[PDB]
Symmetry: D2
Subunit: 482 residues, 4 copies
């Protein structure tokens, strides 16, 4: 009702090119995380409807792959344009359902938009090889072709970007895709589906399914038609999805939990590290995959860094995403708040000091006071688990050799940040760090052209860049007798 | 004992760079598939020995990865030369335990060697990117680094080559590897470990563990130290290994089962076709992963191809691998023979016809008569199972639409072969075929410069070429503030 | 004149981002090649004006290269959109000043636009390297940066497309460019430049200089600020420009003359070969760099091919470009008419038989009759020179060995065309052909994704594809102590 | 004389696979630059002898290109294996003919051999692409093939490594090569040619021509058979060869002259910067092309740098190459000595001061005292010209912005060196420097895996790395109708 185009808010799922309600007419409700008020209902679908979405995708494949990359890119770039054109609404829809301040959601829409554009262009560059033959009577030619029907289970913390990142490459490679978005935040996904429809995406090529994650998830992983699956969420769930895809040996991309260390050295520019700490810890209220989970600060600047950070934090305003000056929104749901409190409680019981914040905000719901902790030790839960909230735990380190042992002492290896001004120390530490991504004197590393992903328990594959499309195609060796 | 160097025949496993028997002193016996005799005993190890193997690898990693690509190349190249130098003995050991003729045994050592050399060279070429930044204040640098400790489980059909194909890339990358080879053929695996040891491979970088396939398998898949696992074998086991590797989200390479179509068209050169048929079918007594399973012949040339194939097959000489003039050795075990008999009896029952062979060979043991069958229809078992024996089942087709349907009518998609003279037809059929590898006017396609692997249920990833090494490295994004 | 945007027609040059007359008010006239009428005037500049353009490009470079690839892509994309939006006007200017039919000029405007788009995207993908080091205390990083001020000299046959193919990859790579279009068709370049102003290309980044070919040329080649030059035209002038460019060791793209053989084999589809002949021979009245210069038809199908070619030639309509249905415009000038005459007269004199046309057309001016010749032999002038007109010289041949020798008996090696069905003969002949580009069973091969360029005396470098931007960047190796 | 294999010293040229004296039986003499004592005679050949070597190259091409890359690699690896095994004598030949210390000569042998190895491996990896078509009816296939007959003209500073830098990539590409080495140091070329003959390099594939620089060069550049030319030497000669090659549009690789700045910033590790000064200024007695020509040291560190520099120069023992402890052999000839003295006198005349050296060494001939100069300004000769002698001229600088202007105030741009410890500065400066190669906190940059070459008047193309082979091959685009 508050949009230039209210038909962007959808209360039906998108199955095989058609807008539909659940087969049983079951629906669940979606609430504004800041106010708690109802935003309406969406379908509560399951295995049967997902099966139809998968079949449709299979039936849509031959016609979609038969197009040139240039043609697919004409549709994708039309989709891109529509996303740009409806920027203000898409952002409002997102802010309302997910929480983040309008400025951040407009960032997310432009961010999302750029993945569509990037993969439109990449589609035209998926390239094979002609190679030198080891046998004179033979020639070697290698081509690439879409893998088949793709599926993707996206999370709630970036309800729009996550759709573009997973839809973009599949369609660009010549694949149809079935997407199950997060139950918390389905509107942003459906808003994308609707604009993709307008752009001229053929029926079946794109499906957004909404309902029960075990029912839909189970169908996706057991269905032999689905040849590749992408999942961005918790490490725990990702391990299970790998197990359920094992019977049909699916090609997997897994984007799992992190535990980002953010390292402020002896010789770092302190102010800039503080600028980069606010960005890497407090944007999206600390709920991103890439968010700092552990601060490691050198003895010799610990005291000075902590003050500067405490100051910086106190200039951040908490309030509803639609209010001006507002930079920290609510935590997504009730369970998110209880997690932060748990980490704070564990730290306090183990000897930590509350520098600032530490409790729920008076505005209620998901709002939580930006928190800084000092004297954080590695026996505390925050050393081993992700907070997913606005909490800055500061560990102390003495030596570069101790740091690397500290930073790496974790199951996960997604993002990592490092502030130092010495060229040789930067490399030595960056190289030693078991992480897929490393920010060097920057707190913001995410973009469309760089390969995004983790190592170790943070999963498999890479999204964005020229590396992004690789997982969505499969390779063919042609050995030609001459 | 008929070797220039009798110490190549090993009866102890190679753990952490130490020759050791099982912790409980247990053993199992290896037999000669051609003559039934005893080739000796090897350790029957299990979990605990594999665990020490795995820890040894981790202990060895820091040192091995800190060598330059060139320094690693030196050692691998010495191992190459040592494998070349000891070709005859390696060929004898291989024939003795596996069955294949000496010519094919020597063929494999040569093939195995070229992999070692190839990856030695590739290691010096594993490369990252520098990409144009989307932010003026930042710089994008991409680097590649070893994933971690690797594991490989290899089969018996190529008990030397498979070792080079999986040890080679790992080491080149900068990875240590634990290798559990087939219990039917362990000596080939050990002999190269022995030659690798002499080449200067430091202790812990290579292990060859021998014994209980389930116990050793479970240890490998559940151990968190193992970050990537390669497996070549049956699709049924591949699926389970992917399930078992899930709790740790390991990088998987799977070279699983196939169901190769050999395709003879209207305008094929029949004499060339028959030459390719014999080679793609009767290599290694039909026991390669890429062996023709289903012959599809066009109705115009069906009777002529059948007569020419039948005549050629009947002139092939069956004997023990060491016997000069013999081109067909034994099937590996009793189970293999019975499978071939089952496939024949099945086809015969359903109305097919015997053209040559069909029975077990007078020499007994694993010796089976090279067999050709006409009148084979898609309802017969061999249409859906791999034979892994010297059986040419001739199916029949009329059109180009029909053949694509029939050839792709399987869960598998490894190797396929296509004989036709029309360029337009060649490309058309090569694109429509869902296989990772396609021979065009040839029946021999396997080399070290071409990427080897399948699609669908044939597996994940590629081996050989510049593609082979990518699954042993992990990529790192560096965002550098400017 | 009679266009939606009359201001698209330009009568001033674009020196350093500002529209200017010659320093000395001098001009020269431009005439319609179909009807001889004065189309208006354009400046007659030289060394002085060219030096300001060059000096302007250097002043603009710092601010242009400082933009992200993303940003430059946007500006080029705005230019792309305008080129598409104004497609109809830009066609008529092109037809009016060059002569080719409207359908063809429209086709060229799209071609031209597809190039702007392509390099907009390639600009974002110019990539360097991180390499495995051969000395453990060092690290190798390769990066790529714009070369510097570029210059381009373009021909008259594609006066829209050539501006796109040279301005596109330059600006995309971070490079400024000074252009001198063919003084026979300068409006099409000026129009493009005008739309680039509208797109927001910063003053100095683009310059279109018009006037004395030799003075602008000699100033381009003598000036040390021009670090790279791109030339598309005759081999004669290409050889001179390389020499003039030696004292500053410029980077050179040279797209020179060809002598394209059109090869029709024994077992070809005759009807597709005729379709191929029409498009490769008579499009833009035989005035393209890739236009067939010599037909080689197998003895066995000579008459059959000649008859069908004669029939299809007669089906073409000669007339002015603005008239509907007209498929053949005039030859761009009188000297071009005299070249065609010179070639025909020589063929007859040495024994060739005329089969259609052979003289100038009734419409006068540049109009010449569609011409086919038979009994053509290697002693003829057309065997060694490019006609650049609607002349189809048919040569005879009796074998594969003989064809390769005939097709290669030339100093040139740009485009070549081959019609055959036998997979084995295609590869043998395609490989044996000393040409940069080979069309197989097609007569049209020009597009944005493929590397366009020749070998031998046809020049150096490649335009388009991902190879196209590479000559516009210089590579820097950074050796970094650890 | 005193060499394990006295037949490595050749007094005859190598033409088309046979050792010949000139047609006219003319010769000229080769002296030791440390004693003046005659080392023997070599043929003084001309056009006629070159022309033959070229024709023999054209003849040998087909049979050389026909071999697989692996087959060519086995021949190149035996040549590698013969250079390593005979490195002792080859070093001694090199010292004797050129001057540099025995130990340095050995480093060059191992350096030259590394190139042979690298390209043997690279030849196996020359790759084309398969690209996504913009037209459904067509397929895009790109292959690479050898360019044809290659010529190389090599200088004296590296009489062995330069041979291998040009021959390796050529033979690996599938080309034959005619090499004319420096008239002053021909024995390294000839010894390696001899080894190549023994290695199994087919006759005609490699020729080494000795005689009149002007006569041989002119034949090479005028002959249309020669389709590409690789040159390393002075910029002046480079400009002439590009002019001479213009009538036939030859593909050029030009490694031309430098003007390297070694930059010592405020925050450098001064001891390490000295270790890099010594390594970049006095290696090969200042006679390398990547030699430091201009030292730029910051105001704060100026004094302290100079003191430490002279303090390391005193440890450097000038002596004949065979004497133990000799780290500085003689310059090549009197003309080089006259040049060093020319700069020193001009610098003194304009204000500079002598720190150490400044005179001819007692030993005479072409030995010269290692010289350091303080108070050098831009107005001096050594500021614009290359010394090619042991002369460290120390320039003073204040701001960063100033340094970039001074460092780039030259037409040349091969190597640059940069010492600084601030990550941000290293990147800002290294990006701003107009040079093909920049060394970061190191004086030694040259190796086989990195792209070697310059920008601006320093030439065209790259040597070593995967980029090295690209200039030896040609791109063929195949547009296949399907």
């Amino acid at each position: 009702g508050s949009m230039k185009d209210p038909s962007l808010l959808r209360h039906q799922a998108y199955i095989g090119g058609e807008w539909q309600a659940a087969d049983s007419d079951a629906t669940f409700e979606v609430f504004d995380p800041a106010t708690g008020e109802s935003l309406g209902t969406v379908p509560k679908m399951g295995a049967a409807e997902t099966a139809r979405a998968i079949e449709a995708a299979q039936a849509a494949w031959a016609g979609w792959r038969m197009k040139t990359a240039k043609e697919r890119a004409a549709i994708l770039r039309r989709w891109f344009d529509l996303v740009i054109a409806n920027s203000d609404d898409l952002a409002l829809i997102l802010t309302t359902e997910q929480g983040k301040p309008l400025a951040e959601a407009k960032g997310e829409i432009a961010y999302a938009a750029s993945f569509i554009e990037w993969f439109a262009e990449e589609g035209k560059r998926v390239a094979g090889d002609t190679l030198p033959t080891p046998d004179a009577n033979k020639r070697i030619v290698v081509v690439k072709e879409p893998i088949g029907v793709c599926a993707a289970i996206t999370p709630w913390n970036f309800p729009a970007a996550m759709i573009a990142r997973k839809v973009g490459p599949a369609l660009a490679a010549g694949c149809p895709i079935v997407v199950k978005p997060a139950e918390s935040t389905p509107f942003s996904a459906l808003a994308m589906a609707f604009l993709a429809e307008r752009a001229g995406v053929p029926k079946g090529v794109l499906s957004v399914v909404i309902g029960d994650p075990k029912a839909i998830g189970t169908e996706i992983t057991s269905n032999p038609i689905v040849r590749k699956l992408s999942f961005t969420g918790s490490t725990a769930v990702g391990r299970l999805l790998m197990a359920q895809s094992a019977p049909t040996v699916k090609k997997l991309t897994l984007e799992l939990g992190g535990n980002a260390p953010f390292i402020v050295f002896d010789d770092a520019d302190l102010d800039a590290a503080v600028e980069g700490a606010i960005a890497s810890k407090y944007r999206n209220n600390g709920q991103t995959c890439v968010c700092t989970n552990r601060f490691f600060v050198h003895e010799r600047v610990y005291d000075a860094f902590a003050d500067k950070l405490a100051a910086a934090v106190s200039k951040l305003k908490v309030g509803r995403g639609t209010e001006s000056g507002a930079t920290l929104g609510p935590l997504i749901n009730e369970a998110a708040v209880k997690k932060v409190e748990s980490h704070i409680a564990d730290a306090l019981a183990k000897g930590a000091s509350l520098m600032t914040g530490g409790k729920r905000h008076a505005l209620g719901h998901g709002f939580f006071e930006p928190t800084v902790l000092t004297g954080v030790k590695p026996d505390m839960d925050v050393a081993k688990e992700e907070t997913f909230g606005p909490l800055a735990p500061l560990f102390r380190f003495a030596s570069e050799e101790e740091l690397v042992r500290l930073a790496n002492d974790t199951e996960f290896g997604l993002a990592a940040y490092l502030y130092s001004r010495d060229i040789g120390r930067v490399w030595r530490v960056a190289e030693a760090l078991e992480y897929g991504m490393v920010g060097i004197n920057t707190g913001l590393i995410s973009n469309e052209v760089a390969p995004f992903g983790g190592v170790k328990q943070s999963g498999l594959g890479r999204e964005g860049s020229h590396y992004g499309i690789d997982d969505y195609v499969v390779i063919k060796y042609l050995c030609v007798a001459v």
